[PDB]
Input
Amino acid sequence: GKCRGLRTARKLRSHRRDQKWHDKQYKKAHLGTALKANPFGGASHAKGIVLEKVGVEAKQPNSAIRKCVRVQLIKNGKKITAFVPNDGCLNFIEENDEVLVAGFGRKGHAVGDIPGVRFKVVKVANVSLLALYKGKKERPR
Amino acid sequence: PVARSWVCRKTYVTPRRPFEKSRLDQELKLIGEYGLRNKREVWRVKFTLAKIRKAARELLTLDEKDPRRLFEGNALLRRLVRIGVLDEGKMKLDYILGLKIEDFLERRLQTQVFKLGLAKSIHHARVLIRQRHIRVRKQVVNIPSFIVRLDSQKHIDFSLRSPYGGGRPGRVKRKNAKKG
Amino acid sequence: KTTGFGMIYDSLDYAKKNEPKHRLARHGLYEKKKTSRKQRKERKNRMKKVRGTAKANVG
Amino acid sequence: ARGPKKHLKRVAAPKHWMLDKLTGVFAPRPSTGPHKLRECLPLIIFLRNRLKYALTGDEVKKICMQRFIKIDGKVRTDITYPAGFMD
Amino acid sequence: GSLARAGKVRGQTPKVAKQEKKKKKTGRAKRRMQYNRRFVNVKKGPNANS
RNA sequence: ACGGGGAAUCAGGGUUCGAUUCCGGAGAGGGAGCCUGAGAAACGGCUACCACAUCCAAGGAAGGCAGCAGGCGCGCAAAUUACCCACUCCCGACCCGGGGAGGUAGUGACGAAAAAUAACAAUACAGGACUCUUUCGAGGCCCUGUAAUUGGAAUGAGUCCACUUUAAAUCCUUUAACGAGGAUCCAUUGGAGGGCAAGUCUGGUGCCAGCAGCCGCGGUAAUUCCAGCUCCAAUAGCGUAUAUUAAAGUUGCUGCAGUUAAAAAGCUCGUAGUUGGAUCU
Ligand SMILES: [Mg+2]
Output
């Protein structure tokens, strides 16, 4: 069992300090390696330039082609893959466009059929994809 | 550095479970019975009662002759008697825990002007108050959530400058009179 | 009902001595100067560059 | 700070002065004198705030420069003069 | 994969216009309608079909 | 990683945040050195060096917005080159002068408070309960709704005299005049298999397009995609991403586990640490 003395505070506190590092959430947050490997660098959104249009085939048992885009981040030069959410929204994006990119819902984890993709597109050329999709705004000319 | 004050509060708390069927039926019944506008108007009164019950539970853990218990117990009981929620002959700290939201909802000006016969329904009372037809002691009030103090129950009347009192007719009767 | 404040002075001379000079202009007993803070400040900074009586002949 | 201070903020003023929050950012800093800064009542907070002989701080100056107020037998024209206990 | 079928069913779907209808009440009068509908005047659901 | 006063969350214990208007510290592009003065190693003072950068007749001269506006850059990320010393105060030789301190307007769905988008009456029913007639029925007693059925009564929101406000204004408050019937003076944002409130409706597509936080849906009758209708949740607000608290008795002091699910050192000695039997009026 555990020690239960009146002069045990140092033992209890040091043991808790040591054993907190075996919690993977705590270690990930407090170690610093997961902050340097994050392409966004701790930000919720980031801007980037479109390099290529890609198509990622879904994981089994699903059979489809999720339509994504390869994006190079402006602030650090890193390269990511971002999923274009809705029906036919890839037709609004063109190469060399500047896009706003956000996380994809699971704090750095992949979501659903889409393998290895952690990001999604929000805006293209300062126009939200929702407004384009619902016909509220059009691409600037 | 500015001569400004940043003190403010939120006056309600949302429920923890958003889609609890028993709570959705219970709250809509209060909305319909007292003619409220939205669910936030139920969570406000419920928050006020929750804070009253919490002060009483904290005072009830003190000694029966604790100086703070006899000072802030009398004050709370007197405050509850003054608005008409608690009875005059029930000034005991254990009768606060027997209070309900319906007691607090009955003292609204909207409920009172209807129960005094000024309005034909609880929805007519709302528009009557918001349209500046009601006064309490020579002061015009257009806030339906105005909690009526007990010794104000007798001074709720039609406004002195309204078509329902001694005032001129509104724009519609004036315009139709000249129509012929 | 309207609520306000009021003062009654013994004489017009005492009123002119003690009253704020913006509350005398409302009665027509005081005229302000028709310039601007920017105008006066810029004029002030130009005279720093000039020395002697030539300060007066500066616009 | 490179020297002595000359200002007083209203929330940092002595509480027994009974100063409200929204009149201004500053409070009268008492002049140096026989009584301490935190144990005194300046003449402006007595002529304006307590006796209401004046409505603004400019009117306190107009009363003072007419040589009407004597603190223990001597005329003081300073409007932040630190009067204190038994004066 | 091949990025050539994007927008397929959304562009294939026939276009149907919305029927114009009487406007909806709002605020204190919309929530009075629900109360009257569910409590004062009344094993199935609000949107049960057939 | 400026430190406190403090902030969010919260059964009790606890966890996280505090650049930020109050108190203390530090700095004025980076180091260093000084003069004056009661007080400075001062930068809206000076002297050098390092890095930038300005005018030039090429000899020379002049620099320091982490002050108020404003511009560039950086970015996911943040407002006017506006008016005034009228208030609060400060400074001076001074009742008089000055103050981008400070105040006032502008931008402002950071966030917080109150609160419109309809109300009533008469009709006739899908009608409903409730009283009597066993039943047909009478219902004027009380109630809800397609009401594309009638009807005048009431009001802002707006336009706009004037006063009031104020240093001068604006706004709020107060008041004449005009100002409401139904595609309007029109409420939105997300959903309808489960978690989790609410359609195995109808049309299109056919493991494609797409949905889907998780389980899962889609291969010619799809409760889940794209739409119409209908339905429900909050509402002048509602979705999404991210950090964080609760949920987490999944960090366990309160309060967890270690035979087989993750786990007792091969065994014993032994210092520090932790803990230590009666017994006195
Ligand atoms: Mg359900």
Remarks:
- The longest helix of chain C spans residues 37-47.
- The two ends of chain C are 53 Å apart (CA to CA).
